[PDB]
Design a protein around this ligand. Structure first.
Ligand SMILES: Nc1ncnc2c1ncn2[C@@H]1O[C@H](COP(=O)(O)OP(=O)(O)OP(=O)(O)O)[C@@H](O)[C@H]1O
Lengths: 54, 109
């Protein structure tokens, strides 16, 4: 699209939308990482099942 | 502390007295214990502290502790200081995990 303004506009719109998608992906990933930490803290912050074998 | 020291010195029936010294971390406990022990002025004074035990094996620990109690049964007036019990027994709250044998040895001693 280097030589046609309309083609360049189309390319830029695609770039914008793809960037937004990337942002959505990042947000989902971060939220999930933050949630996986809390469950991990939940499970072992307490007295535990009776001791293992050896 | 001085009162208790005199009480053990004099009495004929009370042949063993044990004390607990407890408080928040950093309050400065061992200093008090040591000062009492020094000023008491008995013939026979020993200390059990984690510092001496670094690097040894478990059997070694139980041997050492047994020795340190056995040797105190001469010399008819005696004083022992045990420092920081919980770290001697390997406490960590996550499990919790710790060494049961050492705990028993101390309990029976
Ligand atoms: N009034 C006091 N009585 C006892 N110790 C004191 C006093 N004032 C200052 N100290 C200082 O306290 C220190 C010894 O404290 P101690 O070793 O009992 O600390 P601690 O709380 O047992 O340590 P930790 O919690 O790490 O086991 C020395 O530096 C001593 O000079």
């Amino acid at each position: 699209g280097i030589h046609d303004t309309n083609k360049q506009a189309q390319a830029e719109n695609s770039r914008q939308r793809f960037l937004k998608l990337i942002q959505d992906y990042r947000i989902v990933d971060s939220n999930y990482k933050e949630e996986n930490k809390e469950q991990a803290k939940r499970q072992y912050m307490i007295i535990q099942p009776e001791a293992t074998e050896d | 502390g001085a009162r208790y020291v005199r009480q053990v010195r004099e009495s004929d029936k009370s042949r063993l007295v044990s004390l607990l010294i407890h408080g928040p971390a950093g309050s400065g406990k061992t200093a008090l214990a040591a000062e009492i022990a020094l000023k008491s002025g008995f013939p026979f004074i020993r200390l059990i502290s984690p510092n001496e035990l670094s690097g040894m094996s478990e059997s070694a620990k139980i041997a050492y502790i047994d020795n340190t109690f056995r040797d105190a049964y001469k010399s008819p007036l005696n004083i022992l200081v045990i420092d920081s019990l919980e770290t001697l027994v390997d406490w960590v709250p996550i499990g919790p995990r710790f060494s049961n044998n050492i705990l028993q040895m101390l309990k029976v001693a």
